[PDB]
From a paper:
[name] functions as a homo-dimeric enzyme that catalyzes the rate limiting step in the primary salvage pathway for NAD synthesis, the transfer of a phosphoribosyl residue from 5-phosphoribosyl-1-pyrophosphate (PRPP) to nicotinamide (NAM) to produce nicotinamide mononucleotide (NMN).
A previously published in silico model predicted that [name] would protrude its side chain into the tunnel and sterically block inhibitors like APO866 from binding. When tested across a panel of structurally diverse inhibitors, [name] reduced potency across the compound families, but remained more sensitive to APO866 and GMX1778 than series A inhibitors. To reconcile the discrepancy, we determined the crystal structure of [name]-[name]. The bi-aryl sulfone group of series A compounds exceeded the available space, whereas the more flexible and narrower linker of APO866 can fit through the altered tunnel. The [name] and all G217 mutant [name] proteins exhibited at least 100- fold increases in GNE-618 IC50 compared to wild-type.
Numbering used by the authors:
A (entry chain A): 8 to 43, 53 to 487
B (entry chain B): 8 to 42, 53 to 486
C-alpha cells in the first residue's frame, strides 16, 4: 500500500532541522517558469494527485514505524522526524494540515504565472509544505502532455482549416499509440488522460479508467478506437500471402473503419498493386463511415506519406475540394503512425500542403513522441518557497542565482488575476490584497485532508479549447 | 484493481479475428534491435511477471468490466468474452503462457533475443500478443540500467586515470529524478534500475520495489546523505545565507552534509562564506563527515571548474600519486544540475585537462537519468517470429523496403555461446541442430507461475563492469 511518508525525496527527511528556528509557516508555489515555443500551458492533473495520494487518513502508526525503519538503514542514522508525523496522527487523525489553492483545471495560462500554492495550516507543520513537493511537482507530466498535445492540435487545426475550409474531424487527427512506449502502467493512464483533454482518439485504455474515477464525463467514455491490424496479424499469414491477410481483415471489418498496416514487406507495392488492383473491388464498395485506412510504418515520414498519397491518387478517383486541394474518395484514408512528434507533424502537414493534398486525407498516430519524450525542462515546471513566517513576522523569500536569471523565483504571497486587457498576471508580495486587480483566480482545492473543489472532465475539455474552435 | 484484460493496446482486442484460421501457436520475442550503446543490460521483467502476470489474473468480474468498457470504447461489441472465459474455467484464471529469458543483469550485445513468449494452449494462440504491451514496458528498466551503466563506465575510466583506483565509484552518480519522472510507479521502477549499477538514490520508491520483487542481503540497496535545498537556505532571508550555512553544518556536524550554495551567488558562497566566514567549521570536520558543496546553476563544466579553483585557493590542496589536484578530505563537490551522459563526459574531461581528480566530485542526475529516454534509444522491440497453422509451422517476420533496420528475426529462436566466448542468436530453430551448445535462455514463467528468478545481489554481480571484474 502507498505510504506518503516514503513518497518524498530522501534528503527532505532532514529538512525540519534546517529551516530557521521559530518558523510557523512555509508557503510555496508551482509555475511553468518563463525562459529568455510553448507560450501557454494547460493546467491538468492535480486533482488526480490530491485524491489518490493526498486525501484522507494518510498517516498511521504502522506507516510511521515503517518509515522509521527504512530511513534508519537508508541514512545509517536516525534523522527521521517521528514527532512531527505523530502530531499529524494524533491531532488531525492522520489528515494533512495543508491548504492548496489552484487555477481551475483546463485553464490555459501564459508561462511564468502561479498555477498553485501550498501552505501549512498548523504552525507545527511548517516542514510539511515542502515534504509533499516531490509528489506535487509530478503534476509536470499531465500538464506537459496536455500542453504538447494541444500545441499539436493547433497545427492540425491550422492546416486542416486552410486545406479544407473547416475543422470536421480535428478531434480524431492525433491518436495516442503510446501505451507500450511509456515507462509504466501508471504513467500510461495519466498521460493518456492528458491527451484526451484535446482529442478523442486513444489506444491506451487505462486513460479512460482514470478519467472516470477521478474526473468524470457525461458520455460513457471520453476515448475511442477503431479495428486495426498489427504486423503480427499480417505476417502470420506468411510472406507470400500478404494479400490473403489484407483481404481477410477488410472482410472481417467491412462495416467499420479499419486500419491496416501495409509496410510489412513493401508499402509501395501493397498500395499500388494490392490495394490498388488485386483488392480494389473491396475498397471502393466500402461505406463513408467505414473507410479503409492505409497505415505505412517506416521510412522517412514526409517522403513516405507523399509517395503513398501519390500512388493512391493514381489508383483511385481523386477529387479537388473547394479550396483547390486533392481529396481521396471517402472510403480511403491514410494514417501515419511512425516517428510522429510535434516537429515531424509540422513537417508532414506543411509538406502535404505544398504538394496540394488536403489534411482531410490523413490522421496521425503518436506513441513515445506524445507521452514519453518529454521532461520537466520543457515548460520549466518548478516548485519554490516564496513566503515564510519566522518569529511571527512574514518575510518574502526567493532564489536568484547570479549565473542564471531564468531561475529567479517569485517573492511573497501570490495571486493570479485577469488584466484589464483580459490577459493574466501574477501579483507578488501579497499585492493581491490591494484588490486593484479584481478577484484571485486561484481556488481552494485541498484543505486539511479534504478535496474541496473538483472539476468534471467535460468542464476541463471546455476550458482547454482552441480559440479557433471558440470562433 | 489492476485488470490485465484492460492493460493492452486497444486494437489488440480485435486481433483474434485477424490471425489465419486454425492458428494454434503464436510465438514472439523481444530484442534491443541493432542499428553508442553496443550492449544492453537485461533488467525488469521479473518485476512485471510478479506484479502483473502471475497467478489468477482473470475473474468473472474482470471479464464483465472489460466487456462494458470495450463496448463503449469501440461503439460496438468486439471483445473476446469467450477466449477469456476459457482461461477462467480451464486454468482457474492462470495464463497459459511460457516465457523464456536471459538472466537479469546480463549484459548482451544489441540484436540478440532477450526473451521469448508463446502460448501453451492451442485455444489461446491470441494471448501471446495480447500481452505484448505490458511486456514491452520492460524497455524502460532495460534502458535506464543500460544508460546508467554506460555512465559508470565513463566515471570509472576517469576516476582510474586521475586517482589510480575506483574507491567510491558506486557513489559517483546519484538518482535525483523522483520529481522529474512521470509517475510514482515509474519512480520506483527507474530507481531500482539505476541501483543495478550504483548505490546512491534519493528516490525512496526504489528500495521497496527491490525488497519486494528481488531482494538484497543488506537491509537496503541504496543510500543518501543529509542535504539542503533552496527553501532551507532562502527561508533565512536574503541577508542570512551565512546563518543558514552555519546552522545546517552545525546541525549535521558529524555526518556528511550537502549544501546547495547557489541561491544568490555561488562564487561568493564558495570564496567568502565557506572560504572565509565559516572556514573554521569546515576544516575541523571528519573525513567521514565532509561538507559537500552543491552548485546548481550556470554552464555545468564552467561552474565546476571555477568552484574547484575558488576552493583550491581557499583550502589546503594536495597532489595525489597520479599528479592530480585533490581537495582536503572534509571538502567535496556535487554537480546535480543539467547532468546527463553527454554532460557527464564533458565535465570529467574538463576536470582532467585542468588536472583535477574525479575524487573531488560526485554527480546527481534526474530527468537525464530517469525521464529523457525512449523505446528508440535501444530500439526495444517485440515481434512475432513463428506460428503454427493447420498443424504447420511457419517462420514469420517483417522486412520493410524503406527500413532494413526494422527487419525482425525468423522462426524459433535461441541464444548461445560462440567458440570465442560471445553471444549469438540462432534463428529458424537452428539451435536444435546442437552445433552451438545449450540455449542460454531459461524458462522464467509458465502457466501462471514464475519458474525462475534472481536476487538483486546476483543481478548486480551480472551487471558489473569489465574493469571491476
Amino acid at each position: 500500500e502507498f505510504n506518503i511518508l516514503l513518497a518524498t525525496d530522501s534528503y527532505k527527511v532532514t529538512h525540519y532541522k534546517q529551516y530557521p528556528p521559530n518558523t510557523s509557516k512555509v508557503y510555496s508555489y508551482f509555475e511553468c517558469r518563463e525562459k529568455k515555443k510553448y507560450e501557454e500551458t494547460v493546467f491538468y492533473g492535480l486533482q488526480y494527485i490530491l485524491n489518490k495520494y493526498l486525501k484522507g487518513k494518510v498517516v498511521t502508526k504502522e506507516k510511521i514505524q515503517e518509515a522509521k525503519d527504512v530511513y534508519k538503514e537508508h541514512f545509517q542514522d536516525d534523522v527521521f522526524n517521528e514527532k512531527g508525523w505523530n502530531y499529524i496522527l494524533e491531532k488531525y487523525d492522520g489528515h494533512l494540515p495543508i491548504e492548496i489553492k489552484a487555477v481551475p483545471e483546463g485553464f490555459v495560462i501564459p508561462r511564468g504565472n502561479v498555477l498553485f500554492t501550498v501552505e501549512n495550516t498548523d504552525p507545527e507543520c511548517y516542514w510539511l509544505t515542502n515534504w509533499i513537493e516531490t509528489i506535487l511537482v509530478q503534476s509536470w507530466y499531465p500538464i506537459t502532455v496536455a500542453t504538447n498535445s494541444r500545441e499539436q492540435k493547433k497545427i492540425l487545426a491550422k492546416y486542416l482549416l486552410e486545406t479544407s475550409g473547416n475543422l470536421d474531424g480535428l478531434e480524431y487527427k492525433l491518436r495516442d499509440f503510446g501505451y507500450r512506449g511509456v515507462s509504466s502502467q501508471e504513467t500510461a493512464g495519466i498521460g493518456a488522460s492528458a491527451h484526451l483533454v484535446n482529442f478523442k482518439g486513444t489506444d491506451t485504455v487505462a486513460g479512460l479508467a482514470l478519467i472516470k474515477k477521478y474526473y468524470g464525463t457525461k458520455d460513457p467514455v471520453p476515448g475511442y478506437s477503431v479495428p486495426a491490424a498489427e504486423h503480427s496479424t499480417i505476417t502470420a499469414w506468411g510472406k507470400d500471402h500478404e494479400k490473403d491477410a489484407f483481404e481477410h481483415i477488410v472482410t472481417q471489418f467491412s462495416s467499420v473503419p479499419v486500419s491496416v498496416v501495409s509496410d510489412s514487406y513493401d508499402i509501395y507495392n501493397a498500395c499500388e498493386k494490392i490495394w490498388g488492383e488485386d483488392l480494389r473491388h473491396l475498397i471502393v464498395s466500402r461505406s463513408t463511415q467505414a473507410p479503409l485506412i492505409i497505415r505505412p510504418d517506416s521510412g522517412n515520414p514526409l517522403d513516405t506519406v507523399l509517395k503513398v498519397l501519390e500512388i493512391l491518387g493514381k489508383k483511385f478517383p481523386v477529387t479537388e475540394n473547394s479550396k483547390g486541394y486533392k481529396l481521396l474518395p471517402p472510403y480511403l484514408r491514410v494514417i501515419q503512425g511512425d516517428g510522429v512528434d510535434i516537429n515531424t507533424l509540422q513537417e508532414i502537414v506543411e509538406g502535404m500542403k505544398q504538394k496540394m493534398w488536403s489534411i482531410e486525407n490523413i490522421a496521425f498516430g503518436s506513441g513515445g513522441g506524445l507521452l514519453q519524450k518529454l521532461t520537466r525542462d520543457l515548460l520549466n515546471c518548478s516548485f519554490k518557497c516564496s513566503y515564510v513566517v519566522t518569529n511571527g513576522l512574514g518575510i518574502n523569500v526567493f532564489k536568484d542565482p547570479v549565473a542564471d536569471p531564468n531561475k529567479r523565483s517569485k517573492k511573497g504571497r501570490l495571486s493570479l488575476h485577469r488584466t484589464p486587457a483580459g490577459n493574466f498576471v501574477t501579483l507578488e508580495e501579497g499585492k493581491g490584497d490591494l484588490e486593484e486587480y479584481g478577484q484571485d483566480l486561484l481556488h481552494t482545492v485541498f484543505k486539511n485532508g479534504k478535496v474541496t473543489k473538483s472539476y468534471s472532465f467535460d468542464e476541463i475539455r471546455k476550458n482547454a479549447q482552441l480559440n479557433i474552435e471558440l470562433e
